[PDB]
């Protein structure tokens, strides 16, 4: 339908703020803007867009946007050099598929180093200081660092710090035949990761839940997580800080960068209108603020608005780690990379393979046939369909108990503050009467004290003249 903008954005984002920016776009141009949040739009959009229908604009991470363009679902955006300068240069690389821009960057997301301020006022700036910092904290019944070691997304920051990379990115493209997994840099990064486990500084069987709980309970001093986990730490009432990830051999850690992007439908009749909306209404200070006020975006690609968000050290550390991080490729071959590195880490942490053997097979399995891997996943999904469907229900059973625990926390924080605001309001009215009665009393006691001195002088002048005439009259 030409002449009307339809926007699809996930339900966990600030869509109400996005609708307000749409109403502002409608108040100026008269074009209706309807912001919807359908369920599972990452899988529903690729089907509706292929048949012509669908939204004019769709919001989602840039990783899925790669296959969208290969399918022909996203139109090539055309921002001028002026607007390209409004966003950080590295964010455009995440929305560039096949050398052409196919999405507008909105928000930037990357892993950071979260530390307990009560245990560590000064967090370590280097990975080499953690072994000695853990030996110190082990004497006091705690540990230094505990983060997810199962998925390679959490272990890549250390593995790629010395010179690792998924696929080499050049001229705006990706070389599936050039995987940077078994080089001298990745070998040192993974060796130091394994040496941390062999020296009993980390346990190889630590996943996401084990790490999130150990930090919330105050048992470990540090953890590695993204802005999505800040809510869970706020409920634990742990004085935590979000800082830059440690360096390894002088080089900073390289976490994968995820960019929330807004793409224009390739079959949309309102491509020019979507361009006016995204560049001149959404990607502005007033626009992004309306969305961030409804649901925080974290670090955003807009420079002018990142300055104000960067006053929050947590968002400032996320953008710093993102700029030092690695743009996550949107190439479908990435699936082979995820599976290859996953087994490379697990086999190296369990002693199945050495660091050299694990990375050697990983660089080979990264170039594995993707369709063969998909069929391999289909065979295992059916083979373990029972325990898997029970695991998914258990995670949904714990997510409802973990979102009710947050609702109970903000209910507690809203109750104590609303009661403290009325409690101080009573004291302000208490001393207001206590000082009003003190003013009425002290002002009328000093006033009468002046009448005491004036009347006493009148008495002194009257008794002295009455005595004067009483002595003058001699009998």
Author numbering: 3 to 477
Sentences from the paper on this structure:
The histone chaperone chromatin assembly factor 1 (CAF-1) deposits two nascent histone H3/H4 dimers onto newly replicated DNA forming the central core of the nucleosome known as the tetrasome. Three subunits, Cac1, Cac2, and Cac3, form the CAF-1 complex. However, the lysine/glutamic acid/arginine-rich (KER) region of the Cac1 subunit has been implicated as a possible second DNA-binding domain (DBD), as CAF-1 lacking the WHD could still bind to DNA. Structural and biophysical characterization of the lysine/glutamic acid/arginine-rich (KER) region of CAF-1 revealed a 128-Å single alpha-helix (SAH) motif with unprecedented DNA-binding properties.
